[PDB]
Amino acid sequence: FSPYVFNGGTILAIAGEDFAIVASDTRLSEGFSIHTRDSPKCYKLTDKTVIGCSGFHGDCLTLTKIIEARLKMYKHSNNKAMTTGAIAAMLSTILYSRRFFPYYVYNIIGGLDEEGKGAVYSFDPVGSYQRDSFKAGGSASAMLQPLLDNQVGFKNMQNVEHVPLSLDRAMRLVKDVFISAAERDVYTGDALRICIVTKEGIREETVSLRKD
């Protein structure tokens, strides 16, 4: 017996100037077979906060079903709505509550701050948050990140100016990076589900990706 098994996935998050983007491939694969091809991995929490949860698909559901309940409890108690600056600490506490039986997840939080500003957090299986700007991660990580490091925040480039990220550029970059990284990885592909969020709500997006 072994109370752990892999299920793949990939999470990418770009935190621009006044827009947060969370996107993820959709394929539940364990062992060598494929279970389904829809399996969305981008759940909504509030009107201005989206959670992406990769990793083992037995706790990715439990944490999703617990966070909403605790959010409802907080809203009923304090008569407000949790901002994206508190959900990080609350989820970190929940994750660390079982340090001797760790959750096998890799969560990513994206949303808007008090003012119009991008913000993407990043956790670890034991649970320790850290603010970031373009952090990605998941099963097929270590390939998504370096290209973003090259593009978003210009590194190891000289005699080049700095330009803020425009909304038209973000989707064009994300689609290209997923298309490039889908071929060389096994667990990725199928359908791509995009959850760009702005200060008017959540608008959704789905495109094809290496049809399988």
Partner 1 sequence: AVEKRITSPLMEPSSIEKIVEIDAHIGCAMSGLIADAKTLIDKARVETQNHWFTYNETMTVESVTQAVSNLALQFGEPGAMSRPFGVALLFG
Partner 2 sequence: MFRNQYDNDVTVWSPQGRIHQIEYAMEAVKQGSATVGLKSKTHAVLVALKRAQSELAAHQKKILHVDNHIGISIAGLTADARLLCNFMRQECLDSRFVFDRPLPVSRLVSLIGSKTQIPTQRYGRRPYGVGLLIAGYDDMGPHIFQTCPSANYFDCRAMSIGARSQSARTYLERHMSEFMECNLNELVKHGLRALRETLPAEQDLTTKNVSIGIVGKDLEFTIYDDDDVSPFLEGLEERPQ
Partner 3 sequence: PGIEMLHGTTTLAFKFRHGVIVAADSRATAGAYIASQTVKKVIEINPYLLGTMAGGAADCSFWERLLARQCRIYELRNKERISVAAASKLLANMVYQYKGMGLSMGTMICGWDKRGPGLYYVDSEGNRISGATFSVGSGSVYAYGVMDRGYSYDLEVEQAYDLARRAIYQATYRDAYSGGAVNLYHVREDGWIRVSSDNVADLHEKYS
What is the C-alpha separation between 38 and 115, in angstroms, rounded?
34
| Range 57-76, binding partner 1 (CB under 8 A) | 74
Q: How far is the CB of 87 from partner 2 (least distance, A)?
A: 18
Stretch that binds partner 1, among 18-26, 82-90, 99-107, 177-185 (CB under 8 A): 82-90
- Indicate which single residue of 17, 47, 65, 93 sits in contact with partner 2 (rule: CB under 8 A): 65
When binding is defined by CB under 8 A, the residue of 3, 32, 69, 156 that contacts partner 2 is 69
By CB under 8 A, residue 80 contacts partner 2 = no
* CA pair distance 201, 18, nearest whole angstrom: 13
Count of residues engaged in binding partner 1, rule: CB under 8 A = 12
Contacted by 127, from partner 2, partner 1, partner 3, none: CB < 5 to 8 Å by type: partner 3
Which of partner 2, partner 1, partner 3, none does residue 74 bind to, with CB < 5 to 8 Å depending on kind? Answer: partner 1
- Write down the residue that tokens 């995009």 correspond to: 194
SS3 call for 146: helix
Is 93 a binder of partner 1 (CB under 8 A)? yes
Piece of the chain touching partner 2 by CB under 8 A; list 29-37, 66-74, 148-156, 201-209: 66-74
Q: Give dist(CA 13, CA 125) in Å, integer.
A: 18
Counting contacts by CB under 8 A, is residue 66 touching partner 3? no
- How would DSSP label each residue in 148-203? HHHHTS--S--S----PPPHHHHHHHHHHHHHHHHHH-SS--EEEEE--EETTEE-
Interface with partner 2, residue 184, by CB under 8 A: no
Give the bridge partners for 190, in sequence order: 26, 209
Question: CA-CA distance, 146 to 180, in Å (whole number)?
Answer: 13
Distances (CA, A) of 147 to 91, 130, 134, 190: 29, 21, 11, 21
CB of residue 73 vs partner 2: minimum separation in angstroms?
Answer: 7
Of the candidate spans 12-20, 48-56, 64-72, 113-121, the one that interacts with partner 2 by CB under 8 A turns out to be 64-72
**Out of partner 3, partner 1, partner 2, none, which partner does residue 163 contact, by CB within 5 to 8 A per kind?**
none
For the stretch 39-75, what's the b/e string if a residue is b when 16 or more beta carbons lie within 10 angstroms of its beta carbon?
bebbbebbebbbbbbbbbbebbeebbeebeeebeebe
Binding site for partner 2 (CB under 8 A): 65-66, 69, 72-73, 76
